Every structure is written in C-alpha cells, then in structure tokens.
Curated annotation (Swiss-Prot):
Changing residue 50 to A: Reduces RNA-binding affinity 700-fold. Binds to the C-terminus of ATXN2. This is RNA binding protein fox-1 homolog 1. Residues 9-85 form the RRM domain. Signal peptide: none annotated. It is found in: Nucleus; Cytoplasm. It comes from the Eukaryota. The record marks 10, 18-19, 43, 48, 52, 76, 86 as: Interaction with RNA. The lineage of its organism: Eukaryota, Metazoa, Chordata, Craniata, Vertebrata. RNA-binding protein that regulates alternative splicing events by binding to 5'-UGCAUGU-3' elements. Regulates alternative splicing of tissue-specific exons and of differentially spliced exons during erythropoiesis. It comes from Homo sapiens (Human). Predominantly expressed in muscle and brain.
Amino acid sequence: NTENKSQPKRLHVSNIPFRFRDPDLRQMFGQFGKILDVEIIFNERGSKGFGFVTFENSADADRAREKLHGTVVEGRKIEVNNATARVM
RNA sequence: UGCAUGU
C-alpha cells in the first residue's frame, strides 16, 4: 500500500459569529483535533458568516460535525454541513 | 457585516 485509506477533506461551517477567524476554527475544531487546513470565506466587514475546514472522513469526524453543528459560541449556533467541492 | 457551499 502507498495511500492513506482514511484521509480528511473539507467541511462547510456556517452561521458563525462575525468575530471568528481561521485560527479560531482550527482551535475550536481543535478540541477534536483532525484539522489539516482552514478556510474562512471573509469580507472587508468580517467573516462573511461561514468558513470551510479540512476535517471530514472518519466516524469520529462525523461525530465531531454532529457535535459542533448546534454548538453555541458567542451566543450563536454554528451549522457544520458536509460539502460540495465546489461546483454543484 | 446575518452575505449562505469556499478566499
């Protein structure tokens, strides 16, 4: 064998507080700690209201999505959907 | 800024 059968890939992370960043998601998903990369969608005003993170393959990453999908932070529920990449 | 599948 020459390839990782379980490799992570990326994950849509919505309705987040507009004070969020890339390091904030990588640390907050970092409680579970399966992040390869992060990708906030950003505008000149703030976070644009969602990010992407590189995270999802195993059942523990599914469980982790299902936990942070409804996590109240700064008085706000995050909504962590699975992803397109990127055409639909 | 509450923009909704990508900086």
